[PDB]
Homo-oligomer: A and B are copies of this chain.
Amino acid sequence: ELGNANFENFIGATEGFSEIAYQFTSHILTLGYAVMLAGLLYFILTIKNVDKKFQMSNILSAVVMVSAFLLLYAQAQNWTSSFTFNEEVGRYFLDPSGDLFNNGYRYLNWLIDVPMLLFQILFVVSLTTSKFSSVRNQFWFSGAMMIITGYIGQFYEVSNLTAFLVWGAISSAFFFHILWVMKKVINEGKEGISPAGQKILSNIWILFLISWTLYPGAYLMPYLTGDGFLYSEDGVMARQLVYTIADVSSKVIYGVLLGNLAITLS
């Protein structure tokens, strides 16, 4: 009787996880937060490589790295806590005492970092037509709502597909509205800056586009092959891999690029 719990638990409570499935998910989750802390050191140490007016970028990246590190750390410990090795069957099964696994830790992280990552770009690029304050608010309203909704939905990823997908959809709505506004910003930013700067913003968009799309992919990860192929421990491994890749990208790499764009203008 799990209830509204993540499908990792249902997998752990029945089939269990193999050494490879458990270990990899464990390592990939550790790598996640180890990367975040490394990223922090990088942003701080490179604060003096850019002018004074672009530094609020590096700062926000650093703030995000911290936030991320703590929650990705909690998340990794949640994984290892919630699944124990069964010596008589050689598999890792749900361990009631260590609490049920939940990705909500990561989600609420987003609630902090999304608004940060979308806002910090406004400190490097200048807006031609659109208004700083307005673009920000939209980013923040859509950003928050996008997570709050998705956060709510993922609870029902097994106990209720309908609610799962409805919320997932309402979330998706706001998602595109961010993409829209971002593309808008990227352009107005390319207006009046060295080709080098322009090239960097372009690569930032590709990165922002791919990475941010991976998230909803992981949100559905379990069903992307209808009790198919990804409704198993393979689906769990995949989901966490994507998540970790997504974070490293949409945070660290994203921030690095913005740091270079800040130097190109500096």
Whether B112 and A67, one on each chain, are in contact in the complex, defined by CB atoms closer than 8 angstroms, is no
Q: How far is the CB of A60 from chain B (nearest CB, A)?
A: 8
Q: How far is the CA of A76 from the CA of B94 in the complex (A)?
A: 22
A residues 56-75 with Cβ under 8 Å of B?
56, 59, 62-64, 66-67, 70-71, 74
Contact check: which of B42, B67, B102 meets A38 at CB < 8 Å? B67
Q: How far is the CA of A35 from the CA of B108 in the complex (A)?
A: 11
Q: How far is the CB of A73 from chain B (nearest CB, A)?
A: 9
Whether A19 and B5, one on each chain, are in contact in the complex, defined by CB atoms closer than 8 angstroms, is yes
Which residues of chain B come closer than 8 Å to A89, judged between CB atoms? 1
A199 contacts the other chain (CB 8 A): no
Whether A37 and B70, one on each chain, are in contact in the complex, defined by CB atoms closer than 8 angstroms, is yes
Is the interface on chain A under 10, 10 to 19, 20 to 34, or 35 or more residues? 35 or more
Closest partner residue, chain B, to A32 (CB atom): B108
Given A28-B108, A41-B63: A1 touches B87 (CB 8 Å cut-off): yes
A residues 187-202 with Cβ under 8 Å of B?
none
Contact check: which of B18, B55, B70, B155 meets A34 at CB < 8 Å? B70
Quick one: which of A24, A87, A108 has the most chain B CB within 10 A? A108
Whether B71 and A34, one on each chain, are in contact in the complex, defined by CB atoms closer than 8 angstroms, is yes
A residues 225-249 with Cβ under 8 Å of B?
none
Q: How far is the CB of A103 from chain B (nearest CB, A)?
A: 10
Whether A37 and B67, one on each chain, are in contact in the complex, defined by CB atoms closer than 8 angstroms, is yes
Q: How far is the CB of A200 from chain B (nearest CB, A)?
A: 14
Q: How far is the CA of A37 from the CA of B66 in the complex (A)?
A: 7
Contact check: which of B31, B46, B49, B100 meets A85 at CB < 8 Å? B100
A residues 73-130 with Cβ under 8 Å of B?
74, 80, 84-92, 94, 96-97, 99-100, 102, 104-105, 107-109, 111-112
Which residues of chain B come closer than 8 Å to A105, judged between CB atoms? 27, 30
Q: How far is the CA of A24 from the CA of B90 in the complex (A)?
A: 27
Which residues of chain B come closer than 8 Å to A100, judged between CB atoms? 19, 23, 85
Whether A3 and B19, one on each chain, are in contact in the complex, defined by CB atoms closer than 8 angstroms, is yes
